[PDB]
Amino acid sequence: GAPPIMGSSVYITVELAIAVLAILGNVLVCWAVWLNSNLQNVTNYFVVSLAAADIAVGVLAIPFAITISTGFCAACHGCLFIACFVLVLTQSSIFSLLAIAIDRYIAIRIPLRYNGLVTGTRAKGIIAICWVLSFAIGLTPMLGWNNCGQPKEGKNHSQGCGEGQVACLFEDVVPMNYMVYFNFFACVLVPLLLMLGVYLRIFLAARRQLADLEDNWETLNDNLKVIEKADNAAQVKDALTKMRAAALDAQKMKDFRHGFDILVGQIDDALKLANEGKVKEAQAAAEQLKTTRNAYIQKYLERARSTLQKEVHAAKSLAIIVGLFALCWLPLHIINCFTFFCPDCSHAPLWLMYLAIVLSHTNSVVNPFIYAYRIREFRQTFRKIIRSHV
Ligand SMILES: CC(C)CCC[C@@H](C)[C@H]1CC[C@H]2[C@@H]3CC=C4C[C@@H](O)CC[C@]4(C)[C@H]3CC[C@]12C
Ligand SMILES: CC(C)CCC[C@@H](C)[C@H]1CC[C@H]2[C@@H]3CC=C4C[C@@H](O)CC[C@]4(C)[C@H]3CC[C@]12C
Ligand SMILES: CC(C)CCC[C@@H](C)[C@H]1CC[C@H]2[C@@H]3CC=C4C[C@@H](O)CC[C@]4(C)[C@H]3CC[C@]12C
Ligand SMILES: Nc1nc(NCCc2ccc(O)cc2)nc2nc(-c3ccco3)nn12
Ligand SMILES: CCCCCCCC/C=C\CCCCCCCC(=O)O
Ligand code: NA
């Protein structure tokens, strides 16, 4: 077998390349949110916490990963910290990603209550709490769920380690049942399936809300046709009742309210004439709704449709971030599953183990590119920062 330093040099060089890109890209994200008030919303406070976790991957986790690949002799609980710290940052990333999904779900389901419910203060408290929990979850092996009590005495003696020391290798100190059941199934897989369900509900809400907008609009126009060719006052009354309900329903901002005030007032005018049996005069009054429809109602329809389409597109951009997180981390989890569940299968080869580790670290590079390609407000802030400075 080739000298280990050769393959190790490749892995270390690649890790350092990734640490540099993770730092720069996510420093740039944080710098953008700090400078641009348009980016200073509650959603982006989770984006920032997520960016800080990825900066920490380059500053600390990658240097730790480089250290543990050497198998150096170390006290077992110090080895555990080196080995498990990255699990803290990944758990924090899960919480930030989940809060973002719930944040956007709240914004599309109850937008009028959003600013009263989701505030910057409460977001900070949630973020602080999630970091605490991430340390508890990620460092759970440091509380006794480890293999420090069953050291590899063959490795420790050949490595020449001292009293209470072990050859510091990830799979010799971290239990695989912890990695599969606790970390993967419970703390990663379950939150990802929840995020999937949240985003599905976000898209269902938008689809259902866009459909109501268009259904109310068609109800308005169809009933105008009904009124125009109606043959008696009663056919006009029934047509006008179905419009008044749609008018009040669509009403549930200065020029918006004034438009529906005009609309409802004209319907009531036509309704009163129709109750008095004045057919032609009711039809002529109902015909004046077209003015209001073209001047006010069409502009509100188009503006409400545009907001909803923006929320769909934004939700897609954030879902892509969740999907790249899964793409980058699942191979490592899936390999552990094979290692744990198939003791009769050969262990995955070393070159694959480190490709899977490298892939997981690349996730801390991608998020700033998604923002730059998919979020105009980030892309524009990135340009101004770059060309004003570098
Ligand atoms: C706040 C940031 C900048 C500082 C990070 C401190 C890091 C580098 C420190 C904190 C605790 C330290 C570990 C504590 C215990 C041991 C056991 C010892 O037998 C080998 C070194 C090792 C594994 C240390 C390595 C370096 C270490 C991980
Ligand atoms: C999210 C996507 C990319 C999932 C990718 C699936 C990857 C991780 C899967 C697909 C095929 C899998 C390999 C199939 C066969 C073996 C032989 C066994 O003795 C050890 C595990 C090993 C080497 C598997 C490791 C994990 C593996 C490489
Ligand atoms: C992320 C979604 C797709 C579900 C998670 C995929 C994981 C849990 C699935 C996909 C493929 C599955 C593996 C397929 C084959 C084997 C070999 C068997 O001898 C032990 C179980 C094991 C190792 C499975 C464990 C669970 C597994 C890794
Ligand atoms: N299984 C595993 N191994 C390692 N490193 C050690 C790789 C290795 C595996 C076997 C061997 O004989 C020598 C080295 N880091 C690892 N990190 C993770 C991880 C992080 C998140 C989910 O899994 N799993 N994982
Ligand atoms: C911006 C923060 C940068 C932090 C410093 C980065 C340079 C350190 C990176 C890797 C050093 C790895 C230390 C080698 C482990 C010791 C090997 C051994 O004891 O056998
Ligand atoms: Na991350």
PDB file of C-alpha atoms in Angstrom, residues 37-227:
ATOM      1  CA  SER A  37     -31.468  46.943   5.800  1.00  0.00           C
ATOM      2  CA  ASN A  38     -33.559  45.190   3.132  1.00  0.00           C
ATOM      3  CA  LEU A  39     -31.852  41.966   4.263  1.00  0.00           C
ATOM      4  CA  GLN A  40     -32.437  42.667   7.976  1.00  0.00           C
ATOM      5  CA  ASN A  41     -35.562  40.599   8.517  1.00  0.00           C
ATOM      6  CA  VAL A  42     -36.264  37.729  10.883  1.00  0.00           C
ATOM      7  CA  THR A  43     -35.831  35.091   8.177  1.00  0.00           C
ATOM      8  CA  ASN A  44     -32.264  36.263   7.570  1.00  0.00           C
ATOM      9  CA  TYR A  45     -31.370  36.088  11.267  1.00  0.00           C
ATOM     10  CA  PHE A  46     -31.595  32.326  10.817  1.00  0.00           C
ATOM     11  CA  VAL A  47     -29.652  32.630   7.552  1.00  0.00           C
ATOM     12  CA  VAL A  48     -26.957  34.432   9.567  1.00  0.00           C
ATOM     13  CA  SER A  49     -26.922  31.814  12.327  1.00  0.00           C
ATOM     14  CA  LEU A  50     -26.650  29.205   9.573  1.00  0.00           C
ATOM     15  CA  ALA A  51     -23.789  31.190   8.031  1.00  0.00           C
ATOM     16  CA  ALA A  52     -21.999  31.377  11.389  1.00  0.00           C
ATOM     17  CA  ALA A  53     -22.229  27.597  11.704  1.00  0.00           C
ATOM     18  CA  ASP A  54     -20.601  27.258   8.276  1.00  0.00           C
ATOM     19  CA  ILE A  55     -17.870  29.780   9.102  1.00  0.00           C
ATOM     20  CA  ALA A  56     -17.175  27.624  12.158  1.00  0.00           C
ATOM     21  CA  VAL A  57     -16.831  24.566   9.906  1.00  0.00           C
ATOM     22  CA  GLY A  58     -13.821  26.181   8.243  1.00  0.00           C
ATOM     23  CA  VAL A  59     -12.308  27.839  11.304  1.00  0.00           C
ATOM     24  CA  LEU A  60     -12.675  24.844  13.645  1.00  0.00           C
ATOM     25  CA  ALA A  61     -14.394  21.712  12.309  1.00  0.00           C
ATOM     26  CA  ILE A  62     -12.071  21.238   9.321  1.00  0.00           C
ATOM     27  CA  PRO A  63      -8.895  21.706  11.408  1.00  0.00           C
ATOM     28  CA  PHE A  64     -10.451  19.156  13.786  1.00  0.00           C
ATOM     29  CA  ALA A  65     -11.185  16.763  10.912  1.00  0.00           C
ATOM     30  CA  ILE A  66      -7.575  17.094   9.753  1.00  0.00           C
ATOM     31  CA  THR A  67      -6.399  16.321  13.290  1.00  0.00           C
ATOM     32  CA  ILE A  68      -8.495  13.189  13.826  1.00  0.00           C
ATOM     33  CA  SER A  69      -7.471  11.707  10.463  1.00  0.00           C
ATOM     34  CA  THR A  70      -3.921  11.286  11.820  1.00  0.00           C
ATOM     35  CA  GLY A  71      -5.043   8.999  14.653  1.00  0.00           C
ATOM     36  CA  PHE A  72      -2.780  10.859  17.079  1.00  0.00           C
ATOM     37  CA  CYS A  73      -2.693   9.745  20.702  1.00  0.00           C
ATOM     38  CA  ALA A  74      -5.061  11.753  22.881  1.00  0.00           C
ATOM     39  CA  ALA A  75      -7.064  11.585  26.079  1.00  0.00           C
ATOM     40  CA  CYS A  76     -10.335   9.976  25.079  1.00  0.00           C
ATOM     41  CA  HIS A  77     -12.665  12.808  26.130  1.00  0.00           C
ATOM     42  CA  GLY A  78     -10.558  15.387  24.308  1.00  0.00           C
ATOM     43  CA  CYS A  79     -10.678  13.089  21.286  1.00  0.00           C
ATOM     44  CA  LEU A  80     -14.477  12.985  21.610  1.00  0.00           C
ATOM     45  CA  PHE A  81     -14.711  16.782  21.510  1.00  0.00           C
ATOM     46  CA  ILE A  82     -12.555  16.968  18.361  1.00  0.00           C
ATOM     47  CA  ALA A  83     -14.683  14.210  16.836  1.00  0.00           C
ATOM     48  CA  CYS A  84     -18.134  15.482  17.856  1.00  0.00           C
ATOM     49  CA  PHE A  85     -17.856  19.288  17.625  1.00  0.00           C
ATOM     50  CA  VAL A  86     -18.867  19.185  13.953  1.00  0.00           C
ATOM     51  CA  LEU A  87     -22.070  17.442  15.060  1.00  0.00           C
ATOM     52  CA  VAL A  88     -22.927  20.580  17.049  1.00  0.00           C
ATOM     53  CA  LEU A  89     -22.605  22.782  13.974  1.00  0.00           C
ATOM     54  CA  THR A  90     -24.659  20.391  11.841  1.00  0.00           C
ATOM     55  CA  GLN A  91     -27.405  20.203  14.477  1.00  0.00           C
ATOM     56  CA  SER A  92     -27.460  23.999  14.629  1.00  0.00           C
ATOM     57  CA  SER A  93     -27.790  24.024  10.836  1.00  0.00           C
ATOM     58  CA  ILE A  94     -30.811  21.707  11.082  1.00  0.00           C
ATOM     59  CA  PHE A  95     -32.494  24.026  13.589  1.00  0.00           C
ATOM     60  CA  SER A  96     -31.820  27.106  11.461  1.00  0.00           C
ATOM     61  CA  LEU A  97     -33.175  25.349   8.376  1.00  0.00           C
ATOM     62  CA  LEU A  98     -36.292  24.209  10.250  1.00  0.00           C
ATOM     63  CA  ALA A  99     -36.973  27.677  11.683  1.00  0.00           C
ATOM     64  CA  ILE A 100     -36.692  29.135   8.171  1.00  0.00           C
ATOM     65  CA  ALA A 101     -39.296  26.702   6.836  1.00  0.00           C
ATOM     66  CA  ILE A 102     -41.677  27.435   9.717  1.00  0.00           C
ATOM     67  CA  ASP A 103     -41.022  31.167   9.318  1.00  0.00           C
ATOM     68  CA  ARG A 104     -42.057  31.103   5.652  1.00  0.00           C
ATOM     69  CA  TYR A 105     -45.038  28.868   6.452  1.00  0.00           C
ATOM     70  CA  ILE A 106     -46.268  31.396   9.027  1.00  0.00           C
ATOM     71  CA  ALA A 107     -45.781  34.241   6.550  1.00  0.00           C
ATOM     72  CA  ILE A 108     -47.955  32.582   3.898  1.00  0.00           C
ATOM     73  CA  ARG A 109     -50.685  31.235   6.214  1.00  0.00           C
ATOM     74  CA  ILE A 110     -51.243  34.255   8.494  1.00  0.00           C
ATOM     75  CA  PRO A 111     -49.421  37.222   6.904  1.00  0.00           C
ATOM     76  CA  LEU A 112     -51.487  39.800   8.816  1.00  0.00           C
ATOM     77  CA  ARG A 113     -50.355  38.305  12.140  1.00  0.00           C
ATOM     78  CA  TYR A 114     -46.771  37.654  11.023  1.00  0.00           C
ATOM     79  CA  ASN A 115     -45.094  40.829  12.282  1.00  0.00           C
ATOM     80  CA  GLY A 116     -46.894  40.557  15.619  1.00  0.00           C
ATOM     81  CA  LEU A 117     -45.927  36.907  16.113  1.00  0.00           C
ATOM     82  CA  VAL A 118     -42.442  36.571  14.589  1.00  0.00           C
ATOM     83  CA  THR A 119     -40.213  39.332  15.994  1.00  0.00           C
ATOM     84  CA  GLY A 120     -36.473  39.891  16.041  1.00  0.00           C
ATOM     85  CA  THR A 121     -36.341  39.511  19.822  1.00  0.00           C
ATOM     86  CA  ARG A 122     -38.105  36.144  19.792  1.00  0.00           C
ATOM     87  CA  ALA A 123     -35.921  34.942  16.920  1.00  0.00           C
ATOM     88  CA  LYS A 124     -32.762  35.714  18.902  1.00  0.00           C
ATOM     89  CA  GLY A 125     -34.092  33.750  21.872  1.00  0.00           C
ATOM     90  CA  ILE A 126     -34.927  30.796  19.626  1.00  0.00           C
ATOM     91  CA  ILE A 127     -31.458  30.926  18.050  1.00  0.00           C
ATOM     92  CA  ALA A 128     -29.677  31.044  21.417  1.00  0.00           C
ATOM     93  CA  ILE A 129     -31.814  28.142  22.648  1.00  0.00           C
ATOM     94  CA  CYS A 130     -31.111  26.082  19.532  1.00  0.00           C
ATOM     95  CA  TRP A 131     -27.350  26.585  19.908  1.00  0.00           C
ATOM     96  CA  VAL A 132     -27.568  25.320  23.497  1.00  0.00           C
ATOM     97  CA  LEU A 133     -29.544  22.284  22.355  1.00  0.00           C
ATOM     98  CA  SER A 134     -27.076  21.709  19.499  1.00  0.00           C
ATOM     99  CA  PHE A 135     -24.214  21.459  21.997  1.00  0.00           C
ATOM    100  CA  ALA A 136     -26.220  19.020  24.124  1.00  0.00           C
ATOM    101  CA  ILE A 137     -27.139  16.848  21.128  1.00  0.00           C
ATOM    102  CA  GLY A 138     -23.791  16.993  19.331  1.00  0.00           C
ATOM    103  CA  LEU A 139     -21.689  16.397  22.451  1.00  0.00           C
ATOM    104  CA  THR A 140     -23.975  13.730  23.947  1.00  0.00           C
ATOM    105  CA  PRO A 141     -21.107  11.204  23.556  1.00  0.00           C
ATOM    106  CA  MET A 142     -19.120  13.352  26.017  1.00  0.00           C
ATOM    107  CA  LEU A 143     -21.814  12.533  28.614  1.00  0.00           C
ATOM    108  CA  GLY A 144     -21.010   8.804  28.525  1.00  0.00           C
ATOM    109  CA  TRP A 145     -22.425   7.370  25.277  1.00  0.00           C
ATOM    110  CA  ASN A 146     -18.978   6.591  23.907  1.00  0.00           C
ATOM    111  CA  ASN A 147     -16.464   3.766  23.541  1.00  0.00           C
ATOM    112  CA  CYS A 148     -13.862   5.315  25.864  1.00  0.00           C
ATOM    113  CA  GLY A 149     -14.553   2.429  28.248  1.00  0.00           C
ATOM    114  CA  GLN A 150     -13.677  -0.167  25.581  1.00  0.00           C
ATOM    115  CA  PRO A 151     -10.430   1.099  24.040  1.00  0.00           C
ATOM    116  CA  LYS A 152      -8.700  -0.580  21.112  1.00  0.00           C
ATOM    117  CA  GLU A 153      -5.739  -1.877  23.111  1.00  0.00           C
ATOM    118  CA  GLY A 154      -4.007  -3.148  19.970  1.00  0.00           C
ATOM    119  CA  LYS A 155      -4.003   0.275  18.324  1.00  0.00           C
ATOM    120  CA  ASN A 156      -3.161   2.170  21.518  1.00  0.00           C
ATOM    121  CA  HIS A 157      -0.053   0.082  22.218  1.00  0.00           C
ATOM    122  CA  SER A 158       1.250   0.131  18.637  1.00  0.00           C
ATOM    123  CA  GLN A 159       0.694   3.895  18.531  1.00  0.00           C
ATOM    124  CA  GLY A 160       2.523   4.160  21.860  1.00  0.00           C
ATOM    125  CA  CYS A 161      -0.221   6.150  23.573  1.00  0.00           C
ATOM    126  CA  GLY A 162       0.010   7.034  27.251  1.00  0.00           C
ATOM    127  CA  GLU A 163      -2.119   6.299  30.285  1.00  0.00           C
ATOM    128  CA  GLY A 164      -5.802   6.893  29.585  1.00  0.00           C
ATOM    129  CA  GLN A 165      -5.037   7.777  25.955  1.00  0.00           C
ATOM    130  CA  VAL A 166      -6.357   6.242  22.743  1.00  0.00           C
ATOM    131  CA  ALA A 167      -5.516   6.371  19.084  1.00  0.00           C
ATOM    132  CA  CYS A 168      -7.974   9.128  18.193  1.00  0.00           C
ATOM    133  CA  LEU A 169     -10.081   7.677  15.370  1.00  0.00           C
ATOM    134  CA  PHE A 170     -13.715   8.600  14.820  1.00  0.00           C
ATOM    135  CA  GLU A 171     -15.128   5.070  14.649  1.00  0.00           C
ATOM    136  CA  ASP A 172     -13.123   3.888  17.675  1.00  0.00           C
ATOM    137  CA  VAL A 173     -14.592   6.450  20.111  1.00  0.00           C
ATOM    138  CA  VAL A 174     -18.012   7.475  18.731  1.00  0.00           C
ATOM    139  CA  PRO A 175     -20.594   4.641  18.950  1.00  0.00           C
ATOM    140  CA  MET A 176     -22.203   3.761  15.647  1.00  0.00           C
ATOM    141  CA  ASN A 177     -25.587   3.193  17.304  1.00  0.00           C
ATOM    142  CA  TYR A 178     -25.371   6.810  18.460  1.00  0.00           C
ATOM    143  CA  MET A 179     -24.563   7.896  14.900  1.00  0.00           C
ATOM    144  CA  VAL A 180     -27.370   5.876  13.296  1.00  0.00           C
ATOM    145  CA  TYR A 181     -30.248   5.936  15.778  1.00  0.00           C
ATOM    146  CA  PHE A 182     -29.690   9.160  17.700  1.00  0.00           C
ATOM    147  CA  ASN A 183     -27.889  11.484  15.294  1.00  0.00           C
ATOM    148  CA  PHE A 184     -29.118  10.248  11.909  1.00  0.00           C
ATOM    149  CA  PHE A 185     -32.629   8.859  12.481  1.00  0.00           C
ATOM    150  CA  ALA A 186     -33.777  11.131  15.313  1.00  0.00           C
ATOM    151  CA  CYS A 187     -31.790  14.368  15.005  1.00  0.00           C
ATOM    152  CA  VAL A 188     -31.278  14.637  11.218  1.00  0.00           C
ATOM    153  CA  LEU A 189     -33.708  12.455   9.292  1.00  0.00           C
ATOM    154  CA  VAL A 190     -36.818  13.349  11.306  1.00  0.00           C
ATOM    155  CA  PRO A 191     -36.231  17.139  11.068  1.00  0.00           C
ATOM    156  CA  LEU A 192     -35.600  16.839   7.314  1.00  0.00           C
ATOM    157  CA  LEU A 193     -38.881  14.990   6.758  1.00  0.00           C
ATOM    158  CA  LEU A 194     -40.592  17.709   8.806  1.00  0.00           C
ATOM    159  CA  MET A 195     -39.035  20.415   6.629  1.00  0.00           C
ATOM    160  CA  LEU A 196     -40.228  18.510   3.561  1.00  0.00           C
ATOM    161  CA  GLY A 197     -43.753  18.470   4.974  1.00  0.00           C
ATOM    162  CA  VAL A 198     -43.612  22.168   5.843  1.00  0.00           C
ATOM    163  CA  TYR A 199     -42.486  23.162   2.352  1.00  0.00           C
ATOM    164  CA  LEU A 200     -45.202  20.978   0.824  1.00  0.00           C
ATOM    165  CA  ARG A 201     -47.760  22.824   2.954  1.00  0.00           C
ATOM    166  CA  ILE A 202     -46.244  26.144   1.851  1.00  0.00           C
ATOM    167  CA  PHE A 203     -46.722  25.263  -1.819  1.00  0.00           C
ATOM    168  CA  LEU A 204     -50.225  23.916  -1.136  1.00  0.00           C
ATOM    169  CA  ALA A 205     -51.173  27.149   0.646  1.00  0.00           C
ATOM    170  CA  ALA A 206     -49.933  29.298  -2.241  1.00  0.00           C
ATOM    171  CA  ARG A 207     -51.704  27.103  -4.805  1.00  0.00           C
ATOM    172  CA  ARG A 208     -54.945  27.208  -2.811  1.00  0.00           C
ATOM    173  CA  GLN A 209     -54.723  30.971  -2.270  1.00  0.00           C
ATOM    174  CA  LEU A 210     -53.947  31.751  -5.912  1.00  0.00           C
ATOM    175  CA  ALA A 211     -56.957  29.624  -6.876  1.00  0.00           C
ATOM    176  CA  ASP A 212     -59.280  31.570  -4.571  1.00  0.00           C
ATOM    177  CA  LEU A 213     -58.075  34.874  -6.033  1.00  0.00           C
ATOM    178  CA  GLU A 214     -58.845  33.702  -9.566  1.00  0.00           C
ATOM    179  CA  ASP A 215     -62.126  32.044  -8.565  1.00  0.00           C
ATOM    180  CA  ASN A 216     -63.403  35.258  -6.963  1.00  0.00           C
ATOM    181  CA  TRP A 217     -62.296  37.215 -10.037  1.00  0.00           C
ATOM    182  CA  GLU A 218     -64.129  34.900 -12.443  1.00  0.00           C
ATOM    183  CA  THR A 219     -67.191  34.933 -10.179  1.00  0.00           C
ATOM    184  CA  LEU A 220     -67.208  38.717 -10.547  1.00  0.00           C
ATOM    185  CA  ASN A 221     -66.968  38.674 -14.344  1.00  0.00           C
ATOM    186  CA  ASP A 222     -69.377  35.773 -14.893  1.00  0.00           C
ATOM    187  CA  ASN A 223     -72.086  37.411 -12.785  1.00  0.00           C
ATOM    188  CA  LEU A 224     -71.701  40.611 -14.788  1.00  0.00           C
ATOM    189  CA  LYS A 225     -72.577  38.492 -17.825  1.00  0.00           C
ATOM    190  CA  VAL A 226     -75.537  37.070 -15.883  1.00  0.00           C
ATOM    191  CA  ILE A 227     -76.809  40.565 -15.078  1.00  0.00           C
TER     192      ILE A 227
END
